[PDB]
Amino acid sequence: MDDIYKAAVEQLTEEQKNEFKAAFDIFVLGAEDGSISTKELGKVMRMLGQNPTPEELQEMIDEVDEDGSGTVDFDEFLVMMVRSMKDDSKGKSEEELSDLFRMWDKNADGYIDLDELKIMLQATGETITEDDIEELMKDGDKNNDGRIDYDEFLEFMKGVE
C-alpha cells in the first residue's frame, strides 16, 4: 500500500509464488460458511485454464484433505489433483494384511511355507484336518513356483489362510 508503481515492483519477488493462493481467493474470500464449495472444480480452469480430469473429483469423496484443515483449499485442490491417481489413502488398504501375515511369520524370514500357512489356517478352521490344510501352500501360487509371499498370500482369496 505505497505508490501505485512502487507497489507493482514491490510485489515482484519470490513471494509471488505464494501469492498464487490469493489469486483463487478472489473467487471466495468471504463465503457464508468460510469453506470451499464445488466451485473449487471450475476454479482450476477459471485461472489456470487447463483441462483437468474427472477422476480428481472421484478421490475428493474418498479423501482430499491431507494437511489437517478438514477441507480442500484453493491450493490443496492443485496438489491433490494428482492424488486422484493410485494413492494409498482411501481407508481400507491391502497394507493391513502385510502386517497381518508378517506379524506371524514362523521363521520370521518374510516367507510362509506349508507349515507357516497351516498355523495361520488352523487359527480359524472348521473341524478340518491338517492334511487338507497343507494343500494351501500347494494351491496358492500366482506364479506356480511353489512359493507364497505377501502378494501370493493375500492374493489367495481372503479366506484360505
Side-chain angles (χ1 to χ4, degrees):
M1 286 179 222
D2 266 303
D3 251 48
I4 172 55
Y5 246 89
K6 209 109 162 145
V9 45
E10 273 273 77
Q11 283 241 318
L12 273 173
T13 193
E14 263 180 310
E15 84 209 327
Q16 79 197 28
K17 293 239 76 195
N18 201 345
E19 215 245 60
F20 87 117
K21 183 98 118 282
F24 314 121
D25 216 282
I26 303 172
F27 313 143
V28 48
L29 56 140
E32 254 60 274
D33 249 83
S35 92
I36 312 299
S37 199
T38 39
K39 304 275 285 156
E40 103 297 312
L41 164 147
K43 83 95 223 270
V44 189
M45 59 207 87
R46 180 59 165 72
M47 184 138 300
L48 229 94
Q50 72 110 336
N51 45 87
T53 75
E55 217 184 17
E56 300 191 4
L57 274 290
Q58 218 241 98
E59 85 100 71
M60 220 295 304
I61 302 89
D62 268 280
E63 229 189 29
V64 55
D65 198 50
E66 280 190 346
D67 74 301
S69 57
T71 57
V72 50
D73 254 82
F74 314 100
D75 66 312
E76 288 200 51
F77 201 63
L78 292 166
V79 322
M80 78 96 232
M81 83 183 299
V82 306
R83 287 295 116 80
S84 99
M85 229 159 254
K86 301 102 232 225
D87 234 73
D88 275 19
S89 45
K90 273 75 180 220
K92 54 246 163 130
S93 176
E94 272 162 20
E95 219 180 287
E96 269 256 37
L97 188 283
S98 93
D99 271 6
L100 198 288
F101 100 105
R102 172 258 167 71
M103 257 249 161
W104 295 53
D105 211 342
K106 325 311 120 114
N107 305 298
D109 64 336
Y111 199 21
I112 316 303
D113 233 311
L114 307 111
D115 241 81
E116 312 196 71
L117 266 116
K118 168 256 242 210
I119 282 168
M120 183 108 221
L121 200 293
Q122 64 161 26
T124 170
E126 46 156 275
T127 84
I128 54 124
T129 187
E130 286 114 310
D131 205 29
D132 243 45
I133 272 169
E134 273 152 40
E135 199 109 62
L136 242 50
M137 204 270 118
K138 199 256 198 108
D139 223 331
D141 220 349
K142 296 277 280 93
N143 335 276
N144 193 240
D145 67 325
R147 156 149 99 175
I148 318 201
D149 90 298
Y150 168 29
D151 232 300
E152 304 194 71
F153 180 101
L154 81 174
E155 269 292 359
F156 241 136
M157 45 184 287
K158 202 129 186 135
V160 297
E161 239 156 12

